Design a protein around this ligand. Structure first.
Ligand code: ZN
Ligand code: ZN
Ligand code: ZN
Ligand code: ZN
Ligand code: ZN
Ligand code: ZN
Ligand code: ZN
Ligand code: ZN
Ligand code: ZN
Ligand code: ZN
Ligand code: ZN
Ligand code: ZN
Ligand code: ZN
Ligand code: ZN
Ligand code: ZN
Ligand code: ZN
Ligand code: ZN
Ligand code: ZN
Lengths: 131, 131, 131, 131, 131, 131
DNA sequence: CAAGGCACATGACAACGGTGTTCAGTGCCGCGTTGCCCGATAC
DNA sequence: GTATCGGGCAACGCGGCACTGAACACCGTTGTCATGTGCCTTG
């Protein structure tokens, strides 16, 4: 995840930390794992780099029911939606043409110019149910 | 509009206020409008009664980009998704079995036990462009 | 270290954490320890509670070489000075009237009204020197 | 105050500015003084030249209450401690064998190998009261 | 001059300072002027707010021969060009349709998709010669 | 390309290197190209030669957005303004009496004594879109 | 004597990291008060 | 004796004041990258 600013070791460390992890992790916990791993970057830098990466579109952002935001470096750059587990944080990418066609169908039948669809699916894993 | 607690004029007034207004209103602006009406109900009471109504399912909730939660009552008790306009706030009840089938198919494919879908689409209103 | 305002759990947790340890620690290290202990207190509130305690005189504030302010709940409530080991963080309680008398002597000789001595003896332990 | 680097007019100007004034002044205020005097030297160069002098020992570094580090050129070459008035900024150098004796006694008693002591006393001078 | 961020006294002060001045001023010169006016905002926030205002398009950015950029608020919102006096910093709004027409003519004859025109005339102030 | 200094093969090689090239290159890139050719000329001498040529008037300079100044030998000695591409960088000499006449007209009607104007326009190259 | 040419230095802008404001929502003890039930009492 | 009604009393309600916490804004200090001196050497 390259950052559009001038190359520096804090950006490199944050990008590598996103690369290693594949789960939706908040800014605070991401800073916590950076702190305990040894890179030792600040928290406002984590905010700033994550926000810039989200603006550039390198990582996808999700809003949890609590009110915080969580980040993750998706494997595919194509537009997709996510299946997430609150108990584990695991996310898998899913794409469906049917929901897209429904979206523009509804937009056309209401006559709106352009629309933005936010579809998030939340579920519990079968392994999580097992104890 | 029955509530879990004992009926009172304050909760009756807030239920009526939700009845007339058909737009997403946050708790603060709802309280301001109610005070403008003249009932002068406490803000914390409005907060807790809105939370109770949302829990009971009579009122649907939506988390905006800023973070404040907006509340209004939907005429149809059946499950549906709401279309919203930022420039107007108009809300229309839209339902489609296709997204339900897509979500349940993904849940069956990935072995998740039970899932909940939160599908919200944001678009630009038709008359907003006209000026 | 009771707080002037209403007692609450987010402040009782901070007080308990301060009473638990003896080393100097900043608000952000203390916040991490509080979080990983299982209390989940916000950082701004940790900062505010430490500021209030230091204003009331319950805790002793100190600035490291780098300039970040650290705190500690000391056993003795009387006038005292601290011996610190930056490699280990243990603080030793030492008090001397000679430096006080020197302070009044210098103030009287140079005619100053009031005096505030900031005396701090940094050091390295014999055990620390051993490898 | 010779500077470790090659002789240049930027170093000469910063050294002359340090020599002219007798009050503890920060790097940001020293730069403004130089800018008004006609030097036209950049701020980063002032920062790094003051650091070079500080590690060279030719200047005495100090920290203000709010965290900014201030500097002053003291003519006395022997070890000494400073008495500074916050309202005026005027500083008078003082020295007392009592603090050295106490530091040596504490180091001997508690077994610390080597120590470093910081002793600064803050007070208001006579002219502050006069008005 | 509102800023895209939350309203604060630092942004208010920098906006008022830009409103008062009629000549081009850099970031460091404006910071010095605003420091001597007594508002005392930092230089970093001056940089950030000026870049935010330039991005919003409220102020005009001009690069001098030395390479530094100078900002000034222009009352006329319509696109125009500037005539400046490097001896004073004065600016007078000026516009010409012939240059713009030549711009699309040259772009079309060489088939460039879109173009941007940077025309800046540097002149000697009328009263500068008089002495 | 005569040089104000004594003729030597450093200046000869620099003049030749500017001779074959037709694209705008900064001094560091020109030095890298010359080193690749194997002449092994110092970078400070490269600067000195380029500023000497610019003062003499053989070459023309424009300043990039980042701040780098690029030198190029224009075939036409007459005063003209250059169109350059963001990526391709090809330069075409375009001149128009209209902009000049505008410049002296404004200088006269505002009474400016003498004016030094710079005209440079940026645009997206024709074949850049084609891929 | 002057140009060549290193090593090290410079200065406007970008980037960093400990602390501090915002502003929508939560916690708690002071009250009122609905609601029931027994006491009195009219019949 | 049977009867409705009033009042005591509890167990819930309201509700203003102080507190909270994730996100955004801050000021002093350090870093990046293209260009500029001090000083030694050779034509
Ligand atoms: Zn994604
Ligand atoms: Zn799971
Ligand atoms: Zn989609
Ligand atoms: Zn609904
Ligand atoms: Zn649905
Ligand atoms: Zn609309
Ligand atoms: Zn203590
Ligand atoms: Zn003492
Ligand atoms: Zn130790
Ligand atoms: Zn001194
Ligand atoms: Zn001493
Ligand atoms: Zn004084
Ligand atoms: Zn303008
Ligand atoms: Zn124009
Ligand atoms: Zn002028
Ligand atoms: Zn040319
Ligand atoms: Zn021209
Ligand atoms: Zn091109």
């Amino acid at each position: 995840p390259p950052v559009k600013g001038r190359a520096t070791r804090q950006r490199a460390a944050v990008s590598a930390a996103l690369q290693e992890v594949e789960e939706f992790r908040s800014a605070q916990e991401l800073h916590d794992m950076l702190k305990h791993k040894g890179d030792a970057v600040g928290l406002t830098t984590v905010y700033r780099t994550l926000q810039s990466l989200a603006d550039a579109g390198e990582v996808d952002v999700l809003r949890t029911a609590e009110g915080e935001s969580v980040y993750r470096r998706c494997s595919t750059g194509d537009h997709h939606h996510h299946l997430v587990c609150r108990a584990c944080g695991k996310a898998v990418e899913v794409e469906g043409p049917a929901v897209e066609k429904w979206a523009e169908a509804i937009a056309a039948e209401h006559g709106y110019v352009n629309v933005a669809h936010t579809v998030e699916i939340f579920g519990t894993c079968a392994d999580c149910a097992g104890a």
